[PDB]
Design a protein around this ligand. Structure first.
Ligand SMILES: NS(=O)(=O)c1ccc(NC(=O)Nc2ccc(F)cc2)cc1
Ligand SMILES: [Zn+2]
Length: 258
């Protein structure tokens, strides 16, 4: 039927509806730290989220998205490998059923418990729908989560999850500050890639931070109580909503740090 993360509709099946799944710049990938090349030409990452306007949180049946007002330059990503200004439209996470898996990117084959994706689109293309049709249309900032101490800036997200348990549920989520989800360092790896879910469009400049954030076991346990299904349908826990690493093919991962 329609795509997902189960035995019968999971990542190994996606290529039948989305042939680009076997394309030349698919994501995620394994980041081989010893093979990534330090690029001294990479500019400092500029994360400008002080005027962010969060609107809503939505369970879309695959993950949950915290959506932002992207009709003005309010929360933007610039610099690093990017040319121009990319506006924040939403963030979401991928996570595991167990602490030993859940991230999409891996680092020297290591899987983290989850991965945060802050999705931005290039303002020169006018809107998000146009941007995903362009090779430099999106910039996604990826941040690994490990289980340890709680992340205080994540708790407001965790506490609203009871109100969006099932597919199609949304709730107001204003005045949330995404700066509270960032690690101390903005050192990153970067490569050209794709959306990690269908339609798997090859429109993403990936910027993956070296430094993970820590979240508590209670925080990630609350992610795993979410449902892929809609209300009134058979319950399937929303866990392991990650795509495994894809072949790097003709790409070099660049590092901003030595
Ligand atoms: N996991 S990821 O690469 O960050 C990502 C980000 C956004 C989407 N897709 C999305 O938000 N909307 C969308 C809808 C229709 C399209 F044709 C393309 C994107 C999928 C994966
Ligand atoms: Zn994602």
């Amino acid at each position: 039927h329609h795509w997902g993360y189960g035995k019968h509709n999971g990542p190994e099946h996606w290529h039948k509806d989305f042939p680009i799944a076997k394309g030349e710049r698919q994501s995620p990938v394994d980041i081989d730290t010893h093979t990534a090349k330090y690029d001294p030409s990479l500019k400092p990452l500029s994360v400008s989220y002080d005027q962010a306007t969060s609107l809503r949180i939505l369970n879309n049946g695959h993950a949950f998205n915290v959506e932002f007002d992207d009709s003005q330059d309010k929360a933007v990503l610039k610099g690093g490998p990017l040319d121009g200004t990319y506006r924040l439209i939403q963030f979401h996470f991928h996570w595991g059923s167990l602490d030993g898996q859940g991230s999409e990117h891996t680092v020297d084959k290591k899987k983290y418990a989850a991965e945060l994706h802050l999705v931005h689109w290039n303002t020169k293309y006018g809107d998000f729908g146009k941007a995903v049709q362009q090779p430099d249309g999106l910039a996604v900032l990826g941040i690994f989560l490990k289980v340890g101490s709680a992340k205080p800036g994540l708790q407001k997200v965790v506490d609203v999850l009871d109100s969006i348990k099932t597919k199609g549920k949304s709730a107001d989520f204003t005045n949330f500050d995404p700066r509270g989800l960032l690690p101390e360092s903005l050192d990153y790896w970067t490569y050209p890639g794709s959306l990690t879910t269908p339609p798997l469009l090859e429109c993403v400049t990936w910027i993956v931070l070296k430094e993970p954030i820590s979240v508590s076991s209670e925080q990630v346990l609350k992610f795993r109580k979410l449902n892929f299904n809609g209300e009134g349908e058979p319950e399937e826990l929303m866990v392991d909503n990650w795509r495994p690493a894809q072949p790097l093919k003709n790409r070099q991962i660049k590092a901003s740090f030595k």
